A paper describes a structure:
After heterologously overexpressing LFY-N domains from different plant species, we were able to determine the crystal structure for GbLFY-N from the gymnosperm Ginkgo biloba at 2.3 Å resolution. This structure showed that the GbLFY-N monomer is made up of five α-helices separated by four loops. Comparison against the Protein Data Bank revealed a strong structural similarity with the SAM, also called Pointed domain28, a resemblance that could not be predicted from LFY-N sequences. Some SAM domains are able to self-associate as oligomers through the so-called mid-loop (ML) and end-helix (EH) surfaces. GbLFY-SAM appears to belong to this class: in the crystal, it forms a head-to-tail polymer with monomers contacting their neighbours through two polar surfaces. The ML surface comprises negative and polar residues, including T72, T75 and E83, which interact with the positively charged EH surface through hydrogen bonds and salt bridges, in particular via R112 and R116 (residue numbering refers to LFY from A. thaliana—AtLFY—sequence). Size-exclusion chromatography coupled to multi-angle laser light scattering (SEC-MALLS) showed that the WT GbLFY-SAM domain formed oligomers of variable size in solution, depending on protein concentration, containing up to eight monomers. In comparison, all mutations affecting the interaction interface completely abolished LFY oligomerization and GbLFY-SAMTE, GbLFY-SAMRE and GbLFY-SAMTERE proteins were found to be exclusively monomeric. However, when mixed at an equimolar ratio, the GbLFY-SAMTE and GbLFY-SAMRE single-face mutants retained the ability to interact, forming a GbLFY-SAM[RE+TE] dimer, thus showing that the different mutations did not alter the overall fold of the SAM domain, and that single face mutant proteins still displayed one functional interaction surface. These results further showed that the head-to-tail arrangement observed in the crystal structure reflects the state of LFY-SAM in solution, which forms an oligomer of limited size in the conditions of this study. Our results demonstrate that LFY-N is a Sterile Alpha Motif (SAM) domain that mediates LFY oligomerization.
Here we focus on LEAFY (LFY), a plant-specific TF essential for flower development. LFY is one of the few master regulators of flower development, as it integrates environmental and endogenous signals to orchestrate the whole floral network. Structure–function studies have demonstrated that LFY binds semi-palindromic 19-bp DNA elements through its highly conserved C-terminal DBD, a unique helix-turn-helix fold that by itself dimerizes on DNA. In addition to its well-characterized DBD, LFY possesses a second conserved domain at its amino terminus (LFY-N).
Numbering used by the authors: 51 to 135
């Protein structure tokens, strides 16, 4: 209950300014995604999850929302790598 709220806040923070809508975030939390998992996934694995959201989970994704999930993860990966220096 509080754990699901913590995960949603975590994803809201990651995807803020990337056009990911509330119901897309809600579905990702329900699927069990965390920020740490997403930053360690490949570009191809992120493409597969995006396809899974539409095909299996029937989430309605805008075109910019699909590009937004990938851009938010790329930016976070670059922020973490630059920090590691």
């Amino acid at each position: 209950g509080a754990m699901a709220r913590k995960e949603l806040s975590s994803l809201e923070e990651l995807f803020r300014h990337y056009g990911v809508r509330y119901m897309t975030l809600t579905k990702m939390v329900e699927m069990g995604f965390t920020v740490n998992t997403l930053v360690n996934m490949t570009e191809q694995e992120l493409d597969d999850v995006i396809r899974t959201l539409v095909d299996i989970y029937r989430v309605d994704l805008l075109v910019g929302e699909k590009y937004g999930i990938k851009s938010a993860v790329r930016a976070e990966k670059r922020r973490l790598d630059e920090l590691e220096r």
